[PDB]
From a paper:
UPF3 is a key nonsense-mediated mRNA decay (NMD) factor required for mRNA surveillance and eukaryotic gene expression regulation. UPF3 exists as two paralogs (A and B) which are differentially expressed depending on cell type and developmental stage and believed to regulate NMD activity based on cellular requirements. Here, we show that UPF3A and UPF3B share structural and functional homology to paraspeckle proteins comprising an RNA-recognition motif-like domain (RRM-L), a NONA/paraspeckle-like domain (NOPS-L), and extended α-helical domain. Here, we report two crystal structures of the RRM-L and N-terminal region of the middle-domain of UPF3B and UPF3A bound to the MIF4GIII domain of UPF2.
Author numbering:
A (entry chain A): 49 to 170
B (entry chain B): 767 to 1016
C (entry chain D): 768 to 1017
D (entry chain C): 49 to 140, 147 to 169
Write the structure that this text describes.
């Protein structure tokens, strides 16, 4: 059953903390991520967040309480938020495995080092 | 005038992916500081901006991400969430200068199904939104769907070009069959508008785009020759939905 | 008019009010049902049930329920004739036929009470009240002008006649689904710009709706808004979508 | 399943022989007859007919030929006909048949009627 909820068209300057501050009391959830400024349609910038609910009777209250809730940006502009089911219902599931032993090794990689000099003579 | 690590990520995705093997690119991508949230978000944003990639190499990006999720599992979910967010925002903005970027992301989403990053539910969810979001059930023009705006037809055909060939067996076969019924009505809604006259004819390249795509997926499909014929198809199909749902009988 | 033909108008329009229904039945098994002209005359008499006073229309349906054990086709033609008159009533839609059209709808409800028609006939008629000639966006139409609230009276007449029997089984869900669509229709009318502080929505229609809805569902949430009405339709249609497998499987 | 079809809003003076004159060749059917002048909404008088088809495919081509088919009346007025699934899908001995001729309470009624 559908459990992933997106709240979108939030102000592009908002933070995850300001959003949860407006969201309390927040129901129980597995998932709570926050994205912003990652669109390809500049300068139409917005923020969004995804929440995956444990029980699905909370979503109807969450929608009835926040679909239309007006947020404000840095300059007083109104941002009526939209609350819908996320079109992709898959959500992250903990830290399943250990780290890839190669992450953070690009700083000493030879191929990346030759690029740094070509970036000195751009 | 850009941080070197940012230019390197753009080099791997927007330059190297067409020229070198994607596995060599994956070897380098794993070495990035994925434990840094700013870098992880830049790679995700780089892939949401798929419009920077040549149209013929967009599928190499999905092939790369499908190996990346073996080492950074959550990255593929964020990229899909962002591409679907951009597709919805594209219909809300709907400015013609973003036509190539919105075509790219639709092609990307189809490729993401081809490399099993999403299942058919996401594809059909997006396909139906192209024919319903900001669209009047009347069929009359809307502010988000003005009469000469035929971009929904090209968005639908872009996805059906990329991933529609796989909806030929099983439950996905019926899902496409039902959608093509609703798609033929949407097509004849646009063709029925008063704006299309002998002085201002319906674009024949859109006509060929429609039949080219539908003949690629279904050889024995019947292309409707009128709006009344397309409405009758939807009514007969919805009568079947009524029989199966028992809203009147059962 | 001939003697026999006014003999029936005594039996059906006068006697049935203050006489045993079981006595007049054998007195109409008396009639020459082989004669097609007099068999046609009284099928027409029951179709014109507007002659009977309101609170004895169920006695006519009580009589007809007994005869179809001897001349079953007479019930088929009366049921087909009443359903045709209800459809033609919406096409004519002249206020001078209100009392007759209300009686016809009441008759169809009583015909369900005596098992002449099954629930599918009632629910087909009910949905036709909220959709026949109705624009799918709620905009006023040819057959449903803004101040025309007669569909609401037609819905309430049937629901008050036969709706209490939709309390269990399939008919409970069939009614529950229809009430979601009925509440959206009510709010489509209430939101038209014709209704102002100087020209308010008729308060007696409000009471009629709440009576019909409180009689069938004591614990029903009356939507106090159009968006509240629209979101419940979206929620119901989302479940229709899932069970139809149009984006998902199974 | 769904097999009973109605053709309605026909001219009120049209007859059944004339109607099937337009419908021929008629598909395989069990029931087919014709009613007229039986409404409560005088003077809005029309005619109609019901058909029960033996095959599901005969109907999709029957309504494609006759939904919109314009009939004509006595004085030229047009009557575009409608073909839908009939609302009541059910389609159509006794010893006391025709015995109120020579029946006591009937005989009492008729002398109440003469005055």
């Amino acid at each position: 059953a559908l459990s992933k909820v997106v709240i979108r068209r939030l102000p592009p300057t908002l933070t995850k903390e300001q959003l949860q501050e407006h969201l309390q009391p927040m129901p129980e959830h597995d998932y709570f991520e926050f994205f912003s400024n990652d669109t390809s349609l500049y300068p139409h910038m917005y923020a969004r967040a995804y929440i995956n609910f444990k029980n699905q009777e909370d979503i109807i209250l969450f929608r009835d309480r926040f679909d239309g809730y007006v947020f404000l940006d840095n300059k007083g502009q109104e941002y009526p938020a939209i609350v819908e089911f996320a079109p992709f219902q898959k959500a992250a599931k903990k830290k399943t495995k250990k780290r890839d032993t190669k992450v953070g090794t690009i700083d000493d990689d030879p191929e990346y080092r030759k690029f740094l000099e070509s970036y000195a003579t751009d | 005038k850009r941080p070197p690590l940012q230019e390197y990520v753009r080099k791997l995705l927007y330059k190297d992916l067409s020229k070198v093997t994607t596995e060599k690119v994956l070897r380098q991508m794993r070495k990035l500081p994925w434990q840094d949230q700013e870098v992880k978000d830049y790679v995700i944003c780089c892939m949401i901006n798929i419009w920077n990639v040549k149209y013929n190499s967009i599928h190499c990006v999905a092939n790369l991400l499908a190996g990346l999720v073996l080492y950074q599992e959550d990255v593929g979910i964020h990229v899909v969430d962002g591409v679907l967010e951009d597709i919805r925002l594209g219909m809300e903005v709907n400015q013609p200068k973003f036509n190539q970027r919105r075509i790219s992301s639709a092609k990307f989403l189809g490729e993401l199904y081809n490399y099993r990053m999403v299942e058919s539910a996401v594809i059909f969810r997006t396909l139906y939104s192209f024919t319903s979001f900001g669209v009047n059930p009347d069929g009359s023009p809307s502010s988000l769907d003005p009469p000469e705006h035929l971009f929904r037809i090209r968005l639908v055909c872009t996805i059906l070009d990329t991933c529609g060939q796989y909806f030929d067996r099983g439950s996905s076969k019926r899902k496409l069959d039902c959608f093509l019924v609703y798609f033929q009505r949407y097509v004849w809604w646009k063709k029925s508008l008063e704006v299309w006259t002998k002085d201002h004819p319906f674009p024949i390249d859109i006509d060929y785009m429609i039949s080219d795509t539908l003949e690629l997926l279904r050889p024995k499909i019947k292309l409707c020759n009128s709006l009344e014929e397309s409405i009758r198809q939807v009514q007969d199909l919805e009568r079947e939905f009524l029989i199966k749902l028992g809203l009147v009988n059962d």
